[PDB]
Structures are given as structure tokens and as C-alpha cells.
Design a protein around this nucleic acid. Structure first.
Ligand code: MN
Ligand code: MN
Ligand code: NA
Ligand code: NA
Length: 327
DNA sequence: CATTAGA
DNA sequence: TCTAATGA
């Protein structure tokens, strides 16, 4: 956690670099187990060898260790960090929509900068177009103060269209979070569950409405169950306009809301931990349901859930408010 | 790990 | 169809 810090650190630096600049999934994949392990190791690793003893730690990595323990540096790391080429790849990458593959490609073509990114807006797909567009506003945090406004709104329309829709703004915001990266609305409806062959319009109506009133200003990807866009709160009585925000809304078969909600609510560890728990308690929990476990090793049969509670009850736990789902 | 764009 | 990118 701190004792093995630098090690795993350059380690992740290293892996992340393969997979991005290089198409070296393996080596990249290497660096990670190693980093994974040394990370777990209970003692200050003092030299290649020591480390070396570990599963996943080869002569290659071990080699880097020493260099690193001897000199609090690494050439490859010093050389990469410099590399204008791989710098570019790391950078272009931030663009919402740009990934390594494309990061490379642009680079090759010679699109290194954001300005390059502009002059060549043609070479970019819509995703990335918007991605380039709201580049600033994308990178910014979302004041809870604003979250409340946004949430306030979504809620309204959702209801306006059909009183029957149920909505939940999940993620950190739900968990208290003084800020947030983007809003996650989870949605469901009674008419929609496990069997009943969809009703695509379900998602649809909603989006249409959101845009209807001008909340959603763009579409990143509307699909039959996952919309993915951009929103913005009405810029009041001018002088101060609102930053474009990522928004995601997903339709859910009513008979799986809570688990999903539970899930998306996090935190990542509370989740795990909870998950890890359901298990001893003789169960299974995942993004959509919760199943009683059986001795033969495994089992099925999706237990009924009416609220975050039910889930808790099941594994017989203490109801924990979103606020304290921190871990 | 699954859902959407795109080509 | 596959192959990218998001997310989480
Ligand atoms: Mn999100
Ligand atoms: Mn989020
Ligand atoms: Na070893
Ligand atoms: Na990106």
C-alpha cells in the first residue's frame, strides 16, 4: 500500500505504456500481475531477487526493480515520459471517444495536438466530435449543488411522461459525494421486466422529453436500452452559462432494478465486500440478481427483490445508507 | 462484460 | 461481421 508503492507504481506506468503506445498486450499484461503481486507482498522488497521469487516476477521486471531501487528512477520510464510520440498517444486519448487505436492512427497521420484535432474534424466520428467539442467541460467535476439541479429536473420529466417510471440517480452523488464526474440515471418501469419483450419506446420517450425541454443537447449513443449523451442546465439569467455534462440513462427490467441500483451505487469496495459476504451467507450477487447458493458447488433461482433492503435482508446485513456505502 | 457505432 | 470505445 505504501511500502510497495514505487514498485507497483512504475509497474503500472510500465504496463500502461505497453498497451497504449505499443500493441503489446502481453508484456502489458505482464507488468500487471507483477504489480498486482508485489502490491500484495507484506514486506519492503529490497532487490530484484527478493521480488524475483514471486509468481509473475521474472528476470525482466526484477531487472527493472534494482535500477529503480538503486537509482530512484528508470531509463525506459525516463525515455517514455519524454517520448513526444507516446506523449501524444496518452493525450489524444482523453478525448471522449478517442482510444489508443485511434490515438495511434491520428498520431501517425500527424494529429498530435488538439488543434490538429480541430483542423481535422472530418477525420473524426460523431462521438469524438462531440468529445472534442466539450473537451473542456468534460474534464471538469460536477458540483453536487448542480447535481441536485440536474436530478431535480430529470425526475420531473420522467414523471411527466408517465407517472409509472421509477428513477434513481446512482453513483457517488447518491452516496453523498461532494462532486461527481457524470450523472447516472437508472431507470425502470413496471411494464418492463425480464420476459415481456421490451418496449424500446420506454427509453425513447424519456430521452425525447429530456431533449424536449432542452436538457440533453446531444446524443453520444442512443440505443434500445442505454442512452449516452450530454446535458446542460439552463444558463439562468445570463452572465453564467452551464458546462456540458455527460449523462447516461439506462432502462431496466423492473424485476432487477435494486440489484442494479445497488450495484451502480457502489462503492467499488462496498460492493465487493458485500458480494464477498452474500457468499458465506449462502448466496450470489451480481449486477442483476441475487441467487441462493447450493452445495454441489453452484446453484440458480433468482430471489425476489423489492428494495435495496430485500437484498440486505437476504444476506442478512445491516441496512447501510448510500452515504455509508463507502467500503 | 455488455452494449452501441461504424465500416 | 468484427473491432473500437464507454462504462462500471
Ligand atoms: Mn457515468
Ligand atoms: Mn458516474
Ligand atoms: Na518467480
Ligand atoms: Na478516450
Amino acid at each position: 500500500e505504501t511500502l510497495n508503492g514505487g514498485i507497483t507504481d512504475m509497474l503500472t506506468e510500465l504496463a500502461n505504456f505497453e498497451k497504449n503506445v505499443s500493441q503489446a498486450i502481453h508484456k502489458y499484461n505482464a507488468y500487471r500481475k507483477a504489480a498486482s503481486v508485489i502490491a500484495k507482498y507484506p514486506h519492503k522488497i529490497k532487490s530484484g531477487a527478493e521480488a524475483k521469487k514471486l509468481p509473475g516476477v521474472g528476470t525482466k521486471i526484477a531487472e527493472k526493480i534494482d535500477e529503480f531501487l538503486a537509482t530512484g528512477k528508470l531509463r525506459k520510464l525516463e525515455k517514455i515520459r519524454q517520448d513526444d510520440t507516446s506523449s501524444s498517444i496518452n493525450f489524444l486519448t482523453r478525448v471522449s471517444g478517442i482510444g489508443p487505436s485511434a490515438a495511434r492512427k491520428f498520431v501517425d497521420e500527424g494529429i498530435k495536438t488538439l488543434e490538429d484535432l480541430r483542423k481535422n474534424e472530418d477525420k473524426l466520428n460523431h462521438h469524438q466530435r462531440i468529445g472534442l467539442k466539450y473537451f473542456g467541460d468534460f474534464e471538469k467535476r460536477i458540483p453536487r449543488e448542480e447535481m441536485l439541479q440536474m436530478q431535480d429536473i430529470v425526475l420531473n420529466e420522467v414523471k411527466k411522461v408517465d407517472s409509472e417510471y421509477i428513477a434513481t440517480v446512482c453513483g457517488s452523488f447518491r452516496r453523498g459525494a461532494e462532486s461527481s464526474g457524470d450523472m447516472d440515471v437508472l431507470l425502470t418501469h413496471p411494464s418492463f421486466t425480464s420476459e415481456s419483450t421490451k418496449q424500446p419506446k420506454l427509453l425513447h420517450q424519456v430521452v425525447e422529453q429530456l431533449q424536449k425541454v432542452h436538457f440533453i443537447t446531444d446524443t453520444l449513443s442512443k440505443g434500445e436500452t442505454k442512452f449516452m449523451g450530454v446535458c446542460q442546465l439552463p444558463s439562468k439569467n445570463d452572465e453564467k452559462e452551464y458546462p456540458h455534462r455527460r449523462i447516461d440513462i439506462r432502462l431496466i427490467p423492473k424485476d432487477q432494478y435494486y440489484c442494479g441500483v445497488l450495484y451502480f451505487t457502489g462503492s467499488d469496495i462496498f460492493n465487493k465486500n458485500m458480494r464477498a459476504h452474500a457468499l458465506e451467507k449462502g448466496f450470489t450477487i451480481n449486477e442483476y440478481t441475487i441467487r441462493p447458493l447450493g452445495v454441489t458447488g453452484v446453484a440458480g433461482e433468482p430471489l425476489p427483490v423489492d428494495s435495496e433492503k430485500d437484498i440486505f435482508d437476504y444476506i442478512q446485513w445491516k441496512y447501510r445508507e448510500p452515504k455509508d456505502r463507502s467500503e
